[PDB]
Amino acid sequence: SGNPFQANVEMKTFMERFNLTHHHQSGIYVDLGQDKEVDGTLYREPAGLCPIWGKHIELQQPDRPPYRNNFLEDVPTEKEYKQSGNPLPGGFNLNFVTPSGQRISPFPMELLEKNSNIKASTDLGRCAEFAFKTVAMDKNNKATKYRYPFVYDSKKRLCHILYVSMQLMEGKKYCSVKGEPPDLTWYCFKPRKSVTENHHLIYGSAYVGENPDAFISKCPNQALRGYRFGVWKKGRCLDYTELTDTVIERVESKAQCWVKTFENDGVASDQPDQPHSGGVGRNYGFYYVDTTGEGKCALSDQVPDCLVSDSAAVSYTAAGSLSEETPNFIIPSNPSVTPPTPETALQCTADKFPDSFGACDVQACKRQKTSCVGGQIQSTSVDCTADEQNEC
Amino acid sequence: SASDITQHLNDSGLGPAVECLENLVVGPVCPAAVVAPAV
Ligand SMILES: *[C@@H]1O[C@H](CO)[C@@H](O)[C@H](O)[C@H]1NC(C)=O
Ligand SMILES: *[C@H]1O[C@H](CO)[C@H](O)[C@H](O)[C@H]1NC(C)=O
Helix, strand or coil: CCCHHHCCHHHHHHHHCCCHHHHCCCCCCECCCEEEEECCEEEEECCCCCCEECCEEEECCCCCCCCCCCCCCECCEHHHHHHHCCCCCCCCECCCECCCCCECCCEEHHHCCCCCCCCCCCHHHHHHHHHHCEEEECCCCCECCCCCCEEEECCCCEEEEECCCCCCECCCCCCEECCECCCCCCECEEEECCCCCCCCEEEECHHHCCCCCCHHHHCCCCCEEEEEEEEEECCEEEEHHHCCCCEEEECCCHHHHHHHHHHCCCCCECCCCCCCCCCCCCCEEEEEECCCCCEEEEEECCCCCEEEEEEEEEEEECCCCCCCCCCHHHCCCCHHHCCCCHHHHCECCCCCCCCEECCCECCCCEEEEEEEECCEEEEEEEECCCCHHHCC | CCHHHHHHHHHCCCCCCCCCEEECCCEEEECCCCECCCC
8 A cells, every 4th residue: 555646635536537437437439328218118328427539430331422421410311311222321410400490410619608508617518518408309299318429529619419329330230331232221330539530529428418517527538648557556556567457559659559448349338238338348548668669558447546657658548538638628717616637636846755665566576666756746666675676 | 130130229229219309408309301210
């Protein structure tokens, strides 16, 4: 014990944002965590409480008009479907309108940020809240508790409600790839994160809108620069590369690792059988440079409870963004309610923060070293004393 | 073999056929034209 990343309330609060099992509580790759009854029938419903940065649904429609291969396109009318022929054209976007003909989706952020029914402190929160305050009506025109997921486009500042809650469909038995086989209604599609594309798209269930300010402090929205995720054992912080169940893969770039934390086969998924991952899975990872200078990605399902300092490393989660920097569309205007930055949470001053060494871990013959450098907490493992090395 | 596909669709998150959604900001909303039922 003596984990400096659990030493106090603030620190714990900071480290708890990385526990997706606790805060997100649902699938990430595919989120279908809840079940809701509509007109006597049960349906699966996305339920995750954290926004998923960069997540989009890649479609596999034919590369000809009228197909656009863009899940933010309106869902097709029966007429359009008849006109195109198989597979379904269009996308996942809700195309419903008011009696006067006003779209509910996409919905401009300017109309939300000064509205009465919207109390969220950030644009993303406002989109989420907009989604949460949208429910399906049943046959008797009574309100259900079935809600639709959303996508916030932060570049265009547009909030999308998705009529389609499906996130993955594969297999020639169920769907076609570029129109093959032509007998099938559905095109194949899957969740993706891209090294370059669609970083501005944020996917979420409606329920991140239930408490639309929470995600700001309870979710790991941004990548963590200069540290490796680790687990605290035998008096020291073991970064994932020291654990046996950890998956280590070669990468050309840190973005690839960021993508891998979301796309690897062990990530929390509710895809079929109706599994509820509850947010458990290989959701955590980091990019690091090995001793030879090659880029590596370490992936783990162990919830991090400590950090190992490494300036070239970057720690990612399946839920978070590639970028380390906090964008303005999740910063409240009131400074007094913003959460501590990583720099603040991990701050120290050398004259108040002593260099310390932990007891020797004889199994690895290493010990914790915790110190203050550049006004930030350094956490590493170093050699045991010459005296201690006899016990190794 | 066709019920199985249906079941797979339901298991994959295929939603209910609804005519109307209620939104607190803009009120009730409906499709102006019939949506493709397979969606
Ligand atoms: C993460 O959260 C889950 C659910 O609350 C909990 O069981 C688990 O112990 C937590 N792991 C940590 C804090 O490392
Ligand atoms: C949060 O950020 C704001 C600026 O957006 C202020 O700097 C505020 O002091 C910060 N508070 C915390 C908890 O770090």
